[PDB]
Design a protein around this ligand. Structure first.
Ligand code: SO3
Ligand code: SO3
Ligand code: SO3
Ligand code: SO3
Lengths: 219, 219, 217, 222
């Protein structure tokens, strides 16, 4: 009924603008939806070398790639073959604010991702514009229904140079394309995201993510 | 200098709110030294808008603000070359927009290249249900933050049923030419009004009046 | 008629910021219809204060605001019985304060029982460092929310070296008597100033000027 | 770095004083816990200000991260802050504008932790879930722990389940400060927790509270 395969391809085009700098980024990769794992090779096609930390873009580069236990409704795998969309705001602690969206379709073995990313008000000598970010720290998304819609709320942190941290408050709304996909109960999604390799300027990046859904303590 | 007592305003806005793409053209006139401006707005692509027009109206130029002699006018000093702004709008129910405008002048006309993106407006909130009446009069705080002129404001939309709907906005302004003198802390009063519109807001007449001041007791 | 042209102000504040307990007494005067008040303040306990005195000053009465005829004056209408307010103050570096005042009146004097609690001010921040100079003049936005008069404001402290330090504040205002008529949306301009102080701010003279208006046009 | 004097089975003595929306209260607490298992229970009694006119649930995170199960590889700032103790300050920012701040000064004598807790809150809307007592429980959540401004900081966005099944968000920031010098600061880590009112009398004048807390490194090392 769902047509989600153990191994899937990922096609992606991201376009957007941060701090007035336009960019286009293409991604091709593979994932294991039932294992909650995915990888992607990315190439900056326009606007390279990027004047900002590549790390701010990486959560925009699909919750279908999360390991869901049987006892939790898997909204994302239940959304196919028709697919779904998400919208997200990223509010950073120094006033940098980004909005993003992805329209996700599926054709055969391949997920297609139309991603948009817009960012404003990053300070000139902040860690984003100065490329002082090292990685996203592992974090946990809270999944719950708000105004008829599945919503993911998370506070994430970028590890910085010198082992400082840089806070980002994120809210995502997820919407199945097909009418009447059953919404899940409150649950948690643990994730980690990692740049596996990159060239000096981050014109080429190999990206990986692992995500696991769960009910949290006590079980 | 470059600024004439009567100016023309040419504007194109392209954007996306809650997944809905749109294009809006603006043609108008204003008196920069009196801080007054009007515009006729025409929805080109994406009419009729599925969301409240009111969210867009602050994005449709601080050059049209009455500055007293004791306050540095950053905006009139930015011309002929012009300036750009970036803005975030954080609404109380989680809706978040980002906007930008690159402002140029040739002859007696200001040209505005405007982008507007918004996400996470609830289906039954006042924006998607078109339950807003107007922006209440407000006061923007201008000050320098990380080497850039920053405008901070809490605005409120009046709703049908008389409730108020809070928006927190931050704008950064940047002159194109190097070495334009940054002002000291000041305030800008403003009021914005949709003078007329057709049923579906595919046509809108918009007016704004803005006045800079020192605050109490010097205002 | 409860509001006289020249009134006195009695005040006791107690609180705790970043673990440090303090008591501060105030005695002042003002002109309710001119929207002007000043007060002499004295630290009775916990002096010298280890934090910037400025964080407390908006907690040291909107009855002292010049209201024009066309705006309902919730505050002067709340007397002789009084009103109370509650306020949260969210500073941009995570320092968060909450405050309360219960205001009563007898003759020509307002009595104020004030509480002020603050946490999470960083040691390297302007408050614990005492790098504040003044509150910049600001505009509070007054509207009804869930049946209660509410004031929302973005305020900013001028810092040494002319940086600013932002504070977001929400106040809820509550008349003691039933049937005090709620105003419509309006703005209140204010400026607050420490006029004089001794070295450690154990004694402080404070001044405020406030004016209600509709805004443009 | 040193021996904590923390025993496998500990007693907990607590007094909370506070004021929410102008309402003053005193609440006494007596419990027990297993520091190394990350588990604790407490019986709470309202001594002044009963019956409480707001949701008891807003207070329950205020009623000690000693009671967290720490792996060997993550520095345990809380157990290493003993025998001398530590204190925390916390802000609670609810989505409808209610704001609380809280403090706890934590000491130890023999097998007993002592807790001097202060809790103040303002601007809870009269018709909101807190003042209307429409909360059900805190959902399980994960706190992020890292060093900020030289201080161990816990940042968490938590949710109260409401009647009618909506959720009610609270953004909480805690700063933790050891009383003694020389307590090693931990690197970034996560703490999973669950908090539960096991039982209560009708007006919540008497409450039985339980919590389980587990620190980990997150994915993949969890
Ligand atoms: O996917 S994790 O390894 O960042
Ligand atoms: O711009 S004013 O007339 O609302
Ligand atoms: O009252 S003003 O001048 O600080
Ligand atoms: O403490 S747990 O059982 O919610």
């Amino acid at each position: 009924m769902s047509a989600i395969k153990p191994d899937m391809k990922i096609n992606l085009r991201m376009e957007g603008n941060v701090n007035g700098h336009h960019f286009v980024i293409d991604g091709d990769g593979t994932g294991k939806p039932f294992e909650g794992k995915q990888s992607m090779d990315l190439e900056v096609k326009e606007g390279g070398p990027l004047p900002f930390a590549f790390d701010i873009l990486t959560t925009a580069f699909n919750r279908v790639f999360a390991e869901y236990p049987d006892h939790i409704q898997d909204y994302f795998k239940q959304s196919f073959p028709k697919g779904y969309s998400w919208e997200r705001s990223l509010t950073f602690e120094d006033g940098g604010i980004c909005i993003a969206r992805n329209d996700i379709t599926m054709e055969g073995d391949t997920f297609y991702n139309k991603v948009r990313f817009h960012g404003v008000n990053f300070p000139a000598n902040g860690p984003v514009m100065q490329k002082k970010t090292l990685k996203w720290e592992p974090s946990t998304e809270k999944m719950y229904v708000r105004d008829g819609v599945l919503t993911g709320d998370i506070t994430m942190a970028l590890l910085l140079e010198g082992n400082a941290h840089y806070r980002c408050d994120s809210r995502t709304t997820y919407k199945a394309k097909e009418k009447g996909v059953k919404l899940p109960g409150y649950h948690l999604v643990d994730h980690c995201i990692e740049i596996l390799s990159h060239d000096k300027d981050y014109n080429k990046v190999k990206l990986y993510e692992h995500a696991v859904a769960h009910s949290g303590l006590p079980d």
